[PDB]
Amino acid sequence: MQIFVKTLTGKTITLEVEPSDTIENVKAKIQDKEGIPPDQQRLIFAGKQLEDGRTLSDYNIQKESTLHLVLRLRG
């Protein structure tokens, strides 16, 4: 139901997640929570990268789980 979003500065705001939604729903939830558009967003967690073509339940993620948000902005 709830996820653990953490960043470099230590901001943590709770999110509401469906148990069987998609990764784009997670990105829509975090852009609606703060206002960070998902074109500059990326989710890297547990030593692997995630693509939006697979569901959020395909990657074996439990409830009150942890995720690390990385802002792909520079280059």
Partner 1 sequence: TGQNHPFFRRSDSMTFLGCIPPNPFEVPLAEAIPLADQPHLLQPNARKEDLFGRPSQGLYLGGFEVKESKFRREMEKLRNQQSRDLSLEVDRDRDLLIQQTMRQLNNHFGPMAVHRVKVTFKDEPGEGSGVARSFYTAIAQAFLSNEKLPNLNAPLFYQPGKRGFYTPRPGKNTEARLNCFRNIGRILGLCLLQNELCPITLNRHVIKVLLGRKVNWHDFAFFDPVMYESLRQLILASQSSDADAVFSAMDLAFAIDLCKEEGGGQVELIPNGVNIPVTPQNVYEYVRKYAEHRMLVVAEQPLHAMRKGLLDVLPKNSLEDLTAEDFRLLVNGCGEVNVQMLISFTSFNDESGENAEKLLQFKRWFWSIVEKMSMTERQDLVYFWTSSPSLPASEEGFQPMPSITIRPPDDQHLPTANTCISRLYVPLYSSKQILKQKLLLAIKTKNFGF
Q: Does 36 bind partner 1 (CB under 8 A)?
A: yes
Residue 63 touching partner 1 (CB under 8 A): yes
Quick one: what does residue 1 bind among its own copies, partner 1, none, with the CB cut-off 5 to 8 Å set by partner type? none
Reported residue count of the chain is: 75
Give the number of other Cβ atoms within 10 Å of residue 22's Cβ: 16
Query: For the stretch 41-67, what's the b/e string if a residue is b when 16 or more beta carbons lie within 10 angstroms of its beta carbon?
Result: bebeeeeeebeeeeebeeeebeeeeeb
Does 39 interact with its own copies (rule: CB under 8 A)? yes
- If one asks whether residue 19 binds its own copies (CB under 8 A), the answer comes out as yes
Residue closer to its own copies (CB basis): 16 or 39: 39
